[PDB]
Design a protein around this nucleic acid. Structure first.
Length: 492
DNA sequence: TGTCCCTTCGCGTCTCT
DNA sequence: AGAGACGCGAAGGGACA
């Protein structure tokens, strides 16, 4: 495509077709996906050994191969997986899914090779579970996290009195080596000098870009409290709730402005920045707040709500754009649009709503009020889309009212709930004698899926705290609490 | 042009009261 | 109920060969 070599672009497009060909069945989006983050060697390599990967001792799925390949160094990983997957699975007892998960990142070769080399000395001499070692390694720069963990885990646990859980939490992100190193250096300083509980320091470090956040706090903590009247707790919030270095800096820079000119409480400013891409939200509310509280739009309170979530920027922009079209064209109050946008993935919901509202309301016979309810949760897009698919099959093949399906959908994780009802409603109702309404009741909550999955596992294989509770109790329990409630009872 | 490592950001799901 | 934690992963940048 680009410019350097000559004429061998044939060979590239040759292969591009043969991967739609018959070991893998790659669609366009996937080849694109590989080509994009993986590069051409990646695409070359998939083809290169696509039969070897599909069967043999590996028996990987296509989407697994895609997953491994579509990353910087993808080629290297694919080669390194062929070599090591069997030995890591047998000689160190990992699942394939685990080996893949290690591999599906930038520098997978380095991660895999380093696991092989250090999985024992960690699990043995530092009593770490393999789960934990995989966790540390399942990230960009895994080699470094692993390697650094080995070096510092004695030191961090002896001299600074940290739990191993905490060390793993820190290392189990991108930039582990850095966060670890930076903690070691700054833990005393931050603790004695700036007066922070080690718990808070670990909180901060246990995100991506922790090194930055630690350093930035040390520097900016005094100022934000002294000059800007923030509590250290409030500062730590920002620095560990996603905002990181960026948010802290942005807060300092934009705090006076948003309070004087745009008239917000610092309590709100913190709320807004205590999230991923605070910087983004903040800057977005600095603009846009006017045009939202004018161009009829909304109250500051409402704007703050929309912004106080991951990807607030997206939400605010999607609101300003689609607010008129939804309100005027599809007949929604601004109150509803705000509700829809006041969640993770607001942009996604609003957009999905606009395109599925009519579809649901004519073709599937829902009220708008219903659609809004479905949309007014985290992962709205997913529910709406799943409702669309699964409504007819749920009502016909499994005989539920719509009002029921909407109930199941109207909760965070709606998608999972619905899907899981589909899998389990039969086995539950016939094999263990539950009644749809019960199964629906269980599902109509947060954590509806794990509730159901738990409820089944229990009935099919009556785990240690057997009998005692009859089925109707387990149901009532699961509605009340869910998987927490059932696990909790099992522990008694 | 590939490989490896680091940081920021966005979406989705579950639980803790 | 809503806030907060957790998991997953895209995207963007830097360093070096």
């Amino acid at each position: 495509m680009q410019w350097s070599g000559a004429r061998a672009l044939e060979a590239l497009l040759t292969v591009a077709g043969e991967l739609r060909g018959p070991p893998l069945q790659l669609d366009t989006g996937q080849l694109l996906k590989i080509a994009k983050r993986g590069g051409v060697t990646a695409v070359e390599a998939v083809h290169a050994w696509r039969n070897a990967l599909t069967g043999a001792p590996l028996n990987l799925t296509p989407e697994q191969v895609v997953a491994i390949a579509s990353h910087d160094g993808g080629k290297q990983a694919l080669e390194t997986v062929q070599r090591l997957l069997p030995v890591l699975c047998q000689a160190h007892g990992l699942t394939p899914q685990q080996v893949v998960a290690i591999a599906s990142h930038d520098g997978g070769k380095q991660a895999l090779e380093t696991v092989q080399r250090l999985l024992p000395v960690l699990c043995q001499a530092h009593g770490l579970t393999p789960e934990q070692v995989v966790a540390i390694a399942s990230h960009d720069g895994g080699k470094q996290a692993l390697e650094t963990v080995q070096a510092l885990l004695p030191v961090l646990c002896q001299a600074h009195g940290l739990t191993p859980e905490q060390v793993v939490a820190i290392a189990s992100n991108g930039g582990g080596k850095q966060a670890l190193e930076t903690v070691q250096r700054l833990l005393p300083v931050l603790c004695q000098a700036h007066g922070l509980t080690p718990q808070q320091v670990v909180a901060i470090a246990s995100n991506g870009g922790g090194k930055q956040a630690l350093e930035t706090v040390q520097r900016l903590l005094p100022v934000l409290c002294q000059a800007h009247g923030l509590t250290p707790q409030q500062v730590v919030a920002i620095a560990s709730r996603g905002g990181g270095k960026q948010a802290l800096e942005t807060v300092q820079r934009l705090l006076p402005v948003l309070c004087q000119a745009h008239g917000l409480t610092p309590q709100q400013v913190v709320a807004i920045a205590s999230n991923n891409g605070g910087k983004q939200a903040l800057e977005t509310v600095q603009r846009l707040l006017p045009v939202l509280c004018q161009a009829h739009g909304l109250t500051p309170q409402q704007v703050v709500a929309i912004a106080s979530h991951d990807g607030g920027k997206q939400a605010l922009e999607t609101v300003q754009r689609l607010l008129p079209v939804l309100c005027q064209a599809h007949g929604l109050t601004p109150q509803q649009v705000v509700a829809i946008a006041s969640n993770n993935g607001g942009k996604q919901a609003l957009e999905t709503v606009q395109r599925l509202l009519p579809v649901l309301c004519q073709a599937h016979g829902l009220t708008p009020e219903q659609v809004v309810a479905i949309a007014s949760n985290g992962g709205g897009k997913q529910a709406l889309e799943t409702v669309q698919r699964l409504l007819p099959v749920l009502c016909q093949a499994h005989g539920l009212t719509p009002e029921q399906v909407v109930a199941i959908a109207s909760h965070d994780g709606g998608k999972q709930a619905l899907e899981t009802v589909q899998r389990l409603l039969p086995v539950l109702c016939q094999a263990h004698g539950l009644t749809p309404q019960q199964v629906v009741a269980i599902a109509s909550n947060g954590g509806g899926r794990p509730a159901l999955e738990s409820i089944v596992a229990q009935l099919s294989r009556p785990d240690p705290a057997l009998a005692a509770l009859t089925n109707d109790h387990l149901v009532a329990l699961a509605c009340l609490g869910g998987r927490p409630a059932l696990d909790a009872v099992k522990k008694l």
